[PDB]
């Protein structure tokens, strides 16, 4: 038994020991209570954030067109509007969102997430959409008929102004798909521009876990 065993002299980063204090006199400022306190990083991963869906080439430079997707009376039923890989941390549609940005500080994570659709059109507009989900390891539906036979939620706009799908079994290609499809064309009151929009928001749901810290890829070095 000795205190000079191999590896007792060395400085190892990320190894915790006590250290002497520069001032062992002054150290005194009483703490006060301050509203809002964060003690875990899953307290800001379960907060909603508006995800950009629309990506063109300048509908995301000026990005107030980035968060909303056009709808029209012109379009016929059974044509999809948007869709995405569903894989946060590697798909740029939700990896620069508030929730998604936390998962670029870790490698390997799991849990479930929940997406939210909000229709922001007029209060006299009514339509029906068929939301759809494909399990991982199966391609996106190619027809509204295909989509329907999968898992689907018929969301009536004109009753509900939002819908929440809670999608289990995400973790990191293979991965599910979310697709929205017209079931009917939108019914205008008398509007002469048939522009109606919907937004989408995303947040982590309930239990979630991360392991093993690593540095983010979105900032590159010093420059000053």
């Amino acid at each position: 038994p000795t205190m000079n065993t191999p590896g007792s002299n060395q400085f190892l980063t990320s190894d915790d020991f006590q250290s002497p204090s520069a001032m062992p006199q002054f150290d005194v400022t009483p703490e006060m209570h301050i509203p809002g306190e964060v003690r875990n990083l899953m307290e800001i991963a379960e907060v909603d954030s508006v995800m950009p869906i629309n990506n063109d080439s300048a509908a995301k430079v000026s990005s107030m067109e980035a968060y909303r997707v056009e709808l029209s009376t012109n379009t016929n039923a059974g044509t999809q509007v948007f869709g995405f890989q569903l894989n946060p941390g590697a798909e740029s549609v939700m990896n620069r969102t508030l929730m998604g940005e936390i998962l670029n500080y870790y490698a390997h994570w799991s849990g479930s997430i929940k997406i939210t659709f909000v229709f922001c059109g007029s209060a006299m507009t009514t339509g029906k959409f068929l939301l759809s989900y494909a399990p991982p390891g199966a391609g996106a539906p190619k027809t509204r008929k295909d989509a329907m036979l999968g898992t689907h939620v018929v969301w009536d706009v004109g009753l509900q102004s939002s819908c929440v799908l809670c999608i289990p079994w995400i973790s990191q290609t293979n991965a599910g798909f979310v697709t929205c499809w017209y079931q009917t064309s939108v019914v205008s009151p008398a509007s002469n521009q048939p522009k109606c929009y919907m937004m989408c928001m995303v947040s982590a749901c309930n239990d979630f876990s991360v392991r093993m810290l690593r540095d983010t890829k979105f900032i590159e070095q010093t420059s000053f």
């Binding site: 063109d56 430079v61 999809q80 948007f82 869709g83």
Partner: peptide, 21 residues
């Protein structure tokens, strides 16, 4: 700067080839 929050405007996100799958 190392003393200001000054910034140069940037795109929100990467381009995609089209929004539909």
């Amino acid at each position: 700067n190392s003393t200001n929050v000054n910034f140069e405007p940037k795109p929100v996100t990467e381009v995609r080839t089209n929004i539909i799958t």
